[PDB]
């Protein structure tokens, strides 16, 4: 009966994401992990890699689906017959940005709803962007991401980056 | 199956509160409007007045309950067998304060969960504190609060304040 | 009638070099500036309204387009009554920013002609607030660098009277 | 006697900008809408398109001028014999950034002045960046921008986009 | 004379695991750490200065380079009098950041040798403040997770005396 | 008891009077200060690492307890390798505060001996950043007031090479 969309680029997925989806999966009937294609600010990982890292890391949660999308979030929301979008709020900048996005999307669709979760303290600092930068300098990201993501970074090293 | 607590002093309740509870009531099975007694500070309205203003303004939502409590949120959460506490985030200060509270409460109870909603833009400026100050100076608060609250302010003038 | 009139409200308890800088700056871009000293409904001020108005006059009376007036009650009613074009406030930090953002929206809801314009303090006055200044002077610290001469003297008088 | 500069990229202009300039035009003798060329982070619209969209949307205000400039704001300020620069403050990040810029520019020119306006709540969520992204995905931006901007987005679709 | 002495000032009403963590961390990088308990001028603390000093000693006395001292008056005079190298403060959140930024600049204006260094609390103590702890204990909530044992006991005593 | 060694990391592209003030202040309270110039992994710097190290030496070489060293960005490994007692960062604004709070917690998770201490810039340098300075110089604005002489000259060299 409740269906919530958790959208993002997931480039890559992290333990922070895993925690939020886990927590969301306990309070909503269905959680859709929605991987935006990444219209510019080109992702490190391909959509397919990202979807696959998401499935590996969260496939054990039986009420979680994994889907790529390309489009406006608000149309994806309507098309999915979602009850709400869920986003994480790590810091003040996230708070301001999402506040605005929620109001804009509610203007595009009056049934739009956005609910927010606050990360658990042990994952508070984690973002895909930070993780990419640390891995790009061959820092160890083992503590912050699933095993499959560590391996995908190793592959990326043996290739260009 | 989902039961969420919406705690606050509601002194008085405002159109902002009404909007958040309405929105919450559409995505959870049960919403408990939990009016903290507030003997930290002293409220303008008695708990009984506040409960009554809450019932009048939200009693039309059939899945909403109204209950007074002491303030020790994590015990109330356990006692109510709640799935989460819901809070509004009007501004950055709310964001920081609730972030900390959520982490503290999760430390007291690992099943604690806190979800957040962002007010729509037409209610973003409204707070009970602001409303009290305007009404205390006989400003018109009709646009920002339910009719019963306007009347309760008029009664408070004919008595005191 | 094309003329601008702006209200600069606050408790001014006491006025500081920060306030003086903002009013000076405001006085160059608006025809009239009203320094509006809120009476101080609770959180009782150190200085009486009359002392505060007098310290404001001493420190800014040289600006011929500045008026000094006490008020009580709702800012938005004071705005209407004064036929103001805008209220001016200083923004020292993020908390000021959030609070004034909200107040402006609320007051615009009470009166659609309401307007609020903001100034940001220059760096040499960014750390100064009346509250800080009071606490330092109360402990006989030297506030000479941060306030006008008349304010230094009014603090000395306050000491000789038992603060 | 007062001349205020309102600088930005205006890519495109929005109802937010229109509201700020309208408000500014009531309290200053002259308002200069100053469209920065857009030194990298290349704009969607050419400077000429942007100036033209600004004229169409604000030309009804008889005390408003429209002028393209390079970014070097403090030189533009001197050259224009401006009394102040006016900026909008949408969020805390804007607040911090403009605070610093004002202090830096005052250090470069002691006559420099910066005054700020806060957007009314119905335009608080609108930014050119958000509007571009929605229009790029053929979302309807009619509610948030002038008619000429809707048309300029349609032209951009029939070309690029 | 190459030796560092840092002052950690506050009301400590009561001391918490947050404070304990900061002082512990400070004690590893400075030769001397002075826990400086402000008397609480019209801050009306729950605990007496003597109780507060004693709760500080119990909770931190195992750190051999930490001293415990009450003070009243201006922080900057206490700094000079103690021949401190710096004052140390915690920063839990943005509001703390802004407030301390301003205080540091003001105190540097009063004394050019003044210095203020900041620590950020470890994640498990990030939410903890004396004010929060008081409010929870006042409503008979369990504060055992957030404060030393002696503080739990001092709250129990305060309850048996009417709290 | 043991000697203090603090790392001050950044890109220093270029160094500014703000940096100079922080390092000067740091040098008075720690035995050793390592100015650690991160190579600049993408978002490519205007100045080469070698230019940047040399501008740092010129501007701070008079402080006898300051070293200048280039490193890759992996701060926590550099910390271990240098046997540092702490990393020092400046906090100019709220955004810096949030970002560094998170980084400190992450690095403490990677290494439990990691420590981060913060300084707040004095008000006369609060507005200065390398990023702002670059943009002003790129548009031939005068940056003489905000950076050491050697940096003014390095910008002039960059102009004579077509920038």
CA angle B48, B51, B52 (to 5 degrees): 85
Question: Could you tell me which chain F residue has the CA closest to the CA of A142?
Answer: F110
Q: What is the DSSP letter of F10?
A: E
Contacts of residue F77, Cβ cutoff 8 Å, sequence gap at least 6: A139
Residues from chain C contacting residue B161 (CB–CB below 8 Å): none
CA–CA gap between residue C125 and residue C146 (Å, rounded): 8
Please answer whether residues E150 and E59 qualify as being in contact, where contact means their C-beta atoms are separated by less than 8 angstroms.
yes
* Resolution in units of Å: 2.3
Q: Which of F5, F10, F13, F21 is nearest to F65 (CA)?
A: F5
Please answer whether residues C130 and C11 qualify as being in contact, where contact means their C-beta atoms are separated by less than 8 angstroms.
yes
CA–CA gap between residue C77 and residue F107 (Å, rounded): 54
Task: Give yes or no: D138 in active site.
Answer: no
Q: Is F3 helix (H, G, I), strand (E, B) or coil?
A: coil
Q: Which of E42, E43, E47 is nearest to E15 (CA)?
A: E47
CA–CA gap between residue B83 and residue B33 (Å, rounded): 14
Place of tokens 């205020």: D4
Q: Which of D147, D159, D161, D157 is nearest to D53 (CA)?
A: D147
Question: Solving technique for this entry?
Answer: X-ray
Please answer whether residues F33 and F1 qualify as being in contact, where contact means their C-beta atoms are separated by less than 8 angstroms.
no
State how far Cα F1 lies from the chain centre: 27
Please answer whether residues B18 and B33 qualify as being in contact, where contact means their C-beta atoms are separated by less than 8 angstroms.
no
CA–CA gap between residue B70 and residue B52 (Å, rounded): 17
Please answer whether residues C32 and C4 qualify as being in contact, where contact means their C-beta atoms are separated by less than 8 angstroms.
yes
Q: What is the DSSP letter of C133?
A: H
Question: Could you tell me which chain A residue has the CA closest to the CA of F106?
Answer: A125
Please answer whether residues A21 and A33 qualify as being in contact, where contact means their C-beta atoms are separated by less than 8 angstroms.
yes
Q: Which of B101, B94, B92, B99 is nearest to B128 (CA)?
A: B94
Place of tokens 């509870």: B21
List B1, B41, B81, B143, catalytic entry: B41
The tokens of F89 are what? 């960062």
Half-sphere exposure of C124 (CA within 13 A, CB side): 9
**Residues F10, F12, F13, F19, CA torsion sign:** positive
Angle of the B15-25 helix axis to the B47-58 helix axis, nearest 10: 60
CA–CA gap between residue F137 and residue F155 (Å, rounded): 7
**Residues A48, A54, A60, A66, CA torsion sign:** negative
Q: Are strands B84-88 and B114-117 parallel, antiparallel or unpaired?
A: parallel
Please answer whether residues B140 and B149 qualify as being in contact, where contact means their C-beta atoms are separated by less than 8 angstroms.
no
Please answer whether residues E11 and E40 qualify as being in contact, where contact means their C-beta atoms are separated by less than 8 angstroms.
yes
Please answer whether residues E78 and E7 qualify as being in contact, where contact means their C-beta atoms are separated by less than 8 angstroms.
yes
Residues from chain C contacting residue B91 (CB–CB below 8 Å): 98, 101-102
In which order are the strands placed within the sheet that holds E116-119? E66-71, E32-38, E5-10, E86-90, E116-119, F116-119, F86-90, F5-10, F32-38, F66-71
Of the candidates E4, E119, E123, the beta carbon closest to that of F117 is on E119
Largest CA-CA distance found in chain A, in angstroms, rounded? 48
Angle of the C149-160 helix axis to the C49-60 helix axis, nearest 10: 150
D88 forms beta bridges with D117
In chain C, which residues are followed by a C-to-N distance beyond 2.5 Å, i.e. a gap? none
The tokens of E97 are what? 């950041």
Residues from chain E contacting residue B107 (CB–CB below 8 Å): 124, 127, 145
Minimal CA separation from D72 to chain F, in Å: 7
Q: Is F91 left (phi over 0), alpha (psi -120 to 50) or beta?
A: beta
The tokens of A120 are what? 């658990």
CA–CA gap between residue B126 and residue B119 (Å, rounded): 10
* Residues of F marked as catalytic: 19, 43, 92, 130
Superfamily classification of domain B1-161: HUPs (3.40.50.620)
CA–CA gap between residue A137 and residue A151 (Å, rounded): 15
E97 forms beta bridges with none
Q: What is the DSSP letter of A121?
A: G
CA–CA gap between residue C109 and residue C130 (Å, rounded): 30
Q: What is the DSSP letter of F61?
A: T
Please answer whether residues D116 and D86 qualify as being in contact, where contact means their C-beta atoms are separated by less than 8 angstroms.
yes
Residues from chain C contacting residue F94 (CB–CB below 8 Å): 94
Q: ω into residue B12 within 30 of 0, thus cis?
A: yes
Question: Alpha helices of A4-65 — where are they, by DSSP H?
Answer: 15-25, 47-58
List C19, C27, C52, C134, catalytic entry: C19
Q: How many other β-carbons are positioned within 10 Å of the β-carbon of residue F42?
A: 8
Stated length of chain F: 163
CA–CA gap between residue A54 and residue A108 (Å, rounded): 29
The tokens of C5 are what? 């009139």
Please answer whether residues F57 and F66 qualify as being in contact, where contact means their C-beta atoms are separated by less than 8 angstroms.
no
Place of tokens 């009359």: C50
Stated length of chain D: 161
Contacts of residue E52, Cβ cutoff 8 Å, sequence gap at least 6: E11, E12, E13, E14, E15, E37, E45
Q: What is the CA radius of gyration of chain C?
A: 16
The tokens of F141 are what? 């604005």
The tokens of A77 are what? 């929301």
Kindly list the distances between the CA atom of residue C14 and the CA atoms of C4, C39, C122, in Å, as whole numbers in the listed order: 27, 13, 19
Place of tokens 């030496």: F57
Q: Is F21 helix (H, G, I), strand (E, B) or coil?
A: helix
3-state DSSP of chain B: CCEEEEEECCCCCCHHHHHHHHHHHCCCCEEEEEEECCCCCCCCCCHHHHHHHHHHHHCCCCCEEEEEECCCHHHHHHHCCCCEEEEECCCHHHHHHHHHHHHHHHHHCCCCCEEEECCCHHHCCCCHHHHHHHHHCCCCCCCCCCHHHHHHHHHHHHHCC
Place of tokens 């969607």: D44
Q: Is A5 helix (H, G, I), strand (E, B) or coil?
A: strand
- Residue A10 burial (CB < 10 Å; 0-12/13-18/19+)? buried
Report CB contact under 8 Å: A27, B83: yes
Confirm whether residue E89 is marked as ligand binding. Answer: yes
Q: What's the start-to-end Cα distance of chain E, in Å?
A: 47
State how far Cα E30 lies from the chain centre: 16
Stated length of chain C: 163
Contacts of residue F84, Cβ cutoff 8 Å, sequence gap at least 6: F5, F6, F7, F34, F78
Q: How many other β-carbons are positioned within 10 Å of the β-carbon of residue A76?
A: 19
Please answer whether residues A69 and A102 qualify as being in contact, where contact means their C-beta atoms are separated by less than 8 angstroms.
no
Stated length of chain E: 163
Dihedral (Cα; A63, A65, A71, A73), 10-degree rounding = 20
Q: How many other β-carbons are positioned within 10 Å of the β-carbon of residue A139?
A: 17
Q: What is the DSSP letter of C3?
A: -
Report CB contact under 8 Å: E29, F86: yes
Question: Alpha helices of A26-127 — where are they, by DSSP H?
Answer: 47-58, 73-79, 92-108
Please answer whether residues C29 and D115 qualify as being in contact, where contact means their C-beta atoms are separated by less than 8 angstroms.
yes
Half-sphere exposure of B10 (CA within 13 A, CB side): 35
Confirm whether residue F19 is marked as ligand binding. Answer: yes
Place of tokens 């006008």: C148
3-state DSSP of chain D: CCEEEEEECCCCCCHHHHHHHHHHHCCCCEEEEEEECCCCCCCCCCHHHHHHHHHHHHCCCCCEEEEEECCCHHHHHHHCCCCEEEEECCCHHHHHHHHHHHHHHHHHCCCCCEEEECCCHHHCCCCHHHHHHHHHCCCCCCCCCCHHHHHHHHHHHHHCC
Please answer whether residues C14 and C50 qualify as being in contact, where contact means their C-beta atoms are separated by less than 8 angstroms.
no
Kindly list the distances between the CA atom of residue E138 and the CA atoms of E130, E132, E143, in Å, as whole numbers in the listed order: 12, 10, 10
3-state DSSP of chain E: CCCCEEEEEECCCCCCHHHHHHHHHHHCCCCEEEEEEECCCCCCCCCCHHHHHHHHHHHHCCCCCEEEEEECCCHHHHHHHCCCCEEEEECCCHHHHHHHHHHHHHHHHHCCCCCEEEECCCHHHCCCCHHHHHHHHHCCCCCCCCCCHHHHHHHHHHHHCCC
Query: Which residues does E contribute to its contact with A (CB < 8 Å)?
Result: 94, 123-124, 126
CA–CA gap between residue B161 and residue C111 (Å, rounded): 24
* Residues of E marked as catalytic: 19, 43, 92, 130
CA angle D135, A35, D128 (to 5 degrees): 25
Q: Which of A41, A61, A55, A70 is nearest to A13 (CA)?
A: A55
- Residue F26 burial (CB < 10 Å; 0-12/13-18/19+)? buried
Q: How many other β-carbons are positioned within 10 Å of the β-carbon of residue F91?
A: 22
CA–CA gap between residue D103 and residue F79 (Å, rounded): 35
CA–CA gap between residue B95 and residue A151 (Å, rounded): 36
CA–CA gap between residue F106 and residue F108 (Å, rounded): 5
Task: Give yes or no: D60 in active site.
Answer: no
Minimal CA separation from E29 to chain F, in Å: 7
List D50, D57, D128, D132, catalytic entry: D128
In what helix (H) or strand (E) does residue A116 lie, and over which residues does it extend? strand A114-117
Please answer whether residues F84 and F5 qualify as being in contact, where contact means their C-beta atoms are separated by less than 8 angstroms.
yes
CA–CA gap between residue E124 and residue F154 (Å, rounded): 46
CA–CA gap between residue E59 and residue E156 (Å, rounded): 17
CA–CA gap between residue C11 and residue C133 (Å, rounded): 14
3-state DSSP of B8-31: ECCCCCCHHHHHHHHHHHCCCCEE
Minimal CA separation from C80 to chain F, in Å: 36
The tokens of F154 are what? 């390095």
Of the candidates C29, C85, C123, the beta carbon closest to that of D84 is on C29
Topology of domain F1-163 in CATH is Rossmann fold (3.40.50)
């Amino acid at each position: 009966k409740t269906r919530v969309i958790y959208p993002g680029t997931f480039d890559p997925i992290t333990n922070g994401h895993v925690d939020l989806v886990t927590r969301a999966s306990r309070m909503f009937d269905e959680v859709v992990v929605a991987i935006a294609i990444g219209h510019h600010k080109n992702p490190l990982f391909s959509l397919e890699e990202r979807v696959a890292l998401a499935q590996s890391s969260l496939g054990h949660l039986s009420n979680v689906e994994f889907v790529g999308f390309d489009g406006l979030l608000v149309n994806f929301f309507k098309e999915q017959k979602a009850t709400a979008v869920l986003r994480g709020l790590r810091a003040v900048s996230d708070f301001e940005y999402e506040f605005q996005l929620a109001n804009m999307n509610r203007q595009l669709d009056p049934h739009f709803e956005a609910v927010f979760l606050t990360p658990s303290e042990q994952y508070s600092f984690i973002s895909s962007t930070l993780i990419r930068e640390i891995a790009r300098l061959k820092g160890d990201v083992t503590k912050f991401v699933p095993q499959a993501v560590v391996e995908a970074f190793e592959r990326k090293h043996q290739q260009g980056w």
